[PDB]
C-alpha cells in the first residue's frame, strides 16, 4: 500500500504542478506512441491468450511493428504535407462532401468504444478483482472513479517516464517469474504439462470433458500455426492482421495525433523506429508471463469445468485472462505488488489519456463544426469534456459484452471485432492514398457496403454467443468456422473491388483538386483548387534512419523465425 500511495502522491503532485504551470524530439514521440498503444488491455489479453493458446498471439504485437514503419515512411509524409490535423479531415479534403467524413468519424468512434476503452476498463476491472477481491461491476465502478480522479488531476515529458515505469515494472516481473519457473528452458521444458487435474463437469450437459482442449495445444510453442487446422493461422496473421494494423496505426486518429507532433519527418521516423524496437519487447514481457501463471497456477487459470470457472471469475468459458493479474498477486514479493499495480495503472492511464484526446479531436472538431461552424473556445472545450464522459460511460455499458466473447478471452475479442469494421476503413484509405481514380461516392459506397457486410457477419457473434469445448456455440459452421482474420481479408478485398467498381463507373475527380493529398504527388509545387507541413530531411540523417530501420526489421524477422 505504501508504494501505491507514493505513486498516487507523485501523480497528484505532477498534475497539480502541470495545471499551475509540435517540435517534439524523436524519443518523446516514440514513448507517446508506445504509451498510447500499450495498456492494461494488452497485458491482460496477451497473458490470457498465451495461457490459452500460446505464443502465436504475441505474433500480433510483432505485426504491429512493420506497419509502424510504413506509417513512418508512407502515410506520414501525406499527413504532414496535406496539413491534416485528423484522419477524417484528410478524406474531407481529398474526396469532399460531409457524408463520408461524418460517417467515417462515427465508425472510428464506435471502433473506439468497442476496441480501446471497453477492453482497458475491463482489464483494469480484472486487475482490481484479482488484487482487491471485489466483484466485477464494483471493480469497474472503482476503476471509473480512480480514472476520473486521474483525469481531473493528472491529465497530460510524461510519455518517457510512463514508458520507463511500465518497462521497468514488466522487466522486474519477468525476472522474478523466469527464476520462479527456472528460466526460459524451465518454461519451455514444462509448459505442455500444464493440464488441470479437474475434468469432471458434474453437470450432465457434457459429463466427462472431451479431453481435447483442457490440455495445452500441441502447437502452443509454434508462432506459426496450420493454415486451416490450427487456430490463428499464418495466412490469418501475416495478411489478416496487416490490414487491421493499417487502420490501427496508419489510419486511426490516436496514432497520427500522437505522431503528428514530431519536430520533422526524420524525428517522426526515428520515433517510429524507437516504437518498433519497444514493440520487440512486449512479447517477452506479456506472453511468457501468462505461461508462467499457467504453469505455477494451472487449476486456477486453465479451468475448463463450467462450475469452477464460474467460481473463479464469474464466467464459465473464460478464466484464461486472469493469467497476468493473478501472477502479480502471488509471484511478486510481499513488499512489492504495489509497484506492479502502479505500472498497470500507468499503462491504463496513458492509453486512456491518448484515447480521450483523440476522441475529443475527432468528435468535437469534425462533427461539431459540421453542425456548428462557429463556436466559442470554452464551448469547444466543454463539448470535448462532455464527449469524453459520454464515450467512457458508453464503453462501460458495452463492457458486459466484452465479459464473455471469443471463447472467454479478451485479445481474441479485440482481434475479431477489429477484423470486421477496420478493413473497410483500411481499403478506403489505401484506395484514396494510392488510387487517384477513386471519387467521393466511389469510396463512400464501397465503405458502406463493407460496413453492411461486416455488421451482417458480426451480429451472430454477439447474438448466438461463443463457447469452449464444454459447450460450443450454436451457429452455422459456414458463418462461424472461418477465422475472423480470414473474413477480414475477404471483406477488405470485396470492399476494394466494390469501391473500384463504383469509381470506374461514375464521374472522376479532377487532378487540380488532388495536389499533395496523394502519395504520388507529395512533392508537387503546384497550387490546390481548395475543394473545401513542408517535410524535409537532410541526406545524412535520412540514411542513418534508413539503415537503423533495416536493422530493426532484421531483428524483428529474426525473432519471428526463432519462434517458428
Amino acid at each position: 500500500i505504501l508504494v501505491i500511495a507514493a505513486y498516487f502522491l507523485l501523480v497528484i503532485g505532477v498534475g497539480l504542478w502541470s495545471m499551475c504551470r509540435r517540435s517534439m524530439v524523436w524519443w518523446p514521440v516514440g514513448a507517446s506512441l508506445f504509451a498510447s498503444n500499450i495498456g492494461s488491455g494488452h497485458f491482460v489479453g496477451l497473458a490470457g491468450t498465451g495461457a490459452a493458446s500460446g505464443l502465436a498471439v504475441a505474433g500480433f504485437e510483432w505485426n504491429a511493428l512493420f506497419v509502424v514503419l510504413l506509417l513512418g515512411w508512407l502515410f506520414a509524409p501525406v499527413y504532414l504535407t496535406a496539413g491534416v490535423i485528423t484522419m477524417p479531415q484528410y478524406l474531407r479534403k481529398r474526396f469532399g462532401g460531409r457524408r463520408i467524413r461524418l460517417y467515417l468519424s462515427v465508425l472510428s468512434l464506435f471502433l473506439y468504444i468497442f476496441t480501446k476503452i471497453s477492453v482497458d476498463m475491463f482489464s483494469g476491472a480484472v486487475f482490481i478483482q484479482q488484487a482487491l477481491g471485489w466483484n466485477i461491476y464494483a471493480s469497474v465502478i472503482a476503476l471509473l472513479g480512480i480514472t476520473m480522479i486521474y483525469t481531473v488531476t493528472g491529465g497530460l515529458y510524461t510519455d518517457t517516464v510512463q514508458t520507463f515505469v511500465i518497462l521497468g515494472g514488466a522487466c522486474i516481473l519477468m525476472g522474478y517469474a523466469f527464476h520462479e519457473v527456472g528460466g526460459y528452458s524451465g518454461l519451455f521444458d514444462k509448459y505442455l504439462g500444464a493440464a488441470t487435474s479437474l475434468t469432471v463437469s458434474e453437470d450432465p450437459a457434457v459429463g466427462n470433458i472431451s479431453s481435447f482442449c483442457y490440455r495445452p495445444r500441441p502447437d502452443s510453442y509454434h508462432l506459426l500455426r496450420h493454415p486451416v487446422t490450427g487456430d490463428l493461422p499464418w495466412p490469418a496473421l501475416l495478411l489478416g492482421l496487416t490490414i487491421v494494423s493499417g487502420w490501427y496505426w496508419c489510419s486511426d486518429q490516436v496514432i497520427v495525433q500522437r505522431c503528428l507532433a514530431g519536430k520533422s519527418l526524420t524525428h517522426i521516423k526515428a520515433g517510429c523506429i524507437l516504437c518498433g524496437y519497444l514493440k520487440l519487447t512486449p512479447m517477452f514481457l506479456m506472453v511468457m508471463p501468462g505461461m508462467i501463471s499457467r504453469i505455477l497456477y494451472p487449476d486456477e487459470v486453465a479451468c475448463v469445468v463450467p462450475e469452477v470457472c464460474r467460481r473463479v471469475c464469474g464466467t464459465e468459458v473464460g478464466c484464461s485472462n486472469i493469467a497476468y493479474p493473478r501472477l502479480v498477486v502471488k509471484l511478486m514479493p510481499n513488499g512489492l505488488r504495489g509497484l506492479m499495480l502502479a505500472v498497470m495503472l500507468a499503462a491504463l492511464m496513458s492509453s486512456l489519456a491518448s484515447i480521450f484526446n483523440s476522441s475529443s479531436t475527432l468528435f468535437t472538431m469534425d462533427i461539431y463544426t459540421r453542425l456548428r461552424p462557429r463556436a466559442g473556445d470554452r464551448e469547444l472545450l466543454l463539448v470535448g469534456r462532455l464527449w469524453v464522459v459520454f464515450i467512457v460511460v458508453v464503453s462501460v455499458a458495452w463492457l458486459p459484452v466484452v465479459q464473455a466473447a471469443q471463447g472467454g478471452q479478451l485479445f481474441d475479442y479485440i482481434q475479431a471485432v477489429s477484423s470486421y469494421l477496420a478493413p473497410p476503413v483500411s481499403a478506403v484509405f489505401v484506395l484514396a492514398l494510392f488510387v487517384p481514380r477513386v471519387n467521393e461516392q466511389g469510396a463512400f459506397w464501397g465503405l458502406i457496403g463493407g460496413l453492411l457486410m461486416g455488421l451482417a457477419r458480426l451480429i451472430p457473434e454477439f447474438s448466438f454467443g461463443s463457447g469452449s469445448c464444454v459447450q460450443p456455440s450454436a451457429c452455422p459452421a459456414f458463418l462461424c468456422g472461418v477465422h475472423y482474420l480470414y473474413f477480414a481479408i475477404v471483406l477488405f478485398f470485396c470492399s476494394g473491388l466494390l469501391t473500384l467498381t463504383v469509381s470506374l463507373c461514375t464521374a472522376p475527380i479532377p487532378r487540380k483538386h488532388l495536389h499533395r493529398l496523394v502519395f504520388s504527388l507529395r512533392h508537387s509545387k503546384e497550387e490546390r483548387e481548395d475543394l473545401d507541413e513542408d517535410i524535409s530531411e537532410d541526406p545524412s540523417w535520412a540514411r542513418v534512419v534508413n539503415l537503423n530501420a533495416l536493422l530493426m526489421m532484421a531483428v524483428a524477422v529474426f525473432l519471428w523465425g526463432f519462434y517458428a
Partner: peptide
C-alpha cells in the same frame, strides 16, 4: 534448432529487402 531457422528468416528477409531496393533504384 530455433537459431538456424531464425538465421534463415533473416537471410530471406535480407534478400527481399535487397530486391526491393534494387527495383526501387531501377524503376526510380
Amino acid at each position: 534448432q530455433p537459431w538456424m531457422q531464425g538465421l534463415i528468416a533473416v537471410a530471406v528477409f535480407l534478400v527481399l529487402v535487397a530486391i526491393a531496393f534494387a527495383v526501387n533504384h531501377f524503376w526510380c
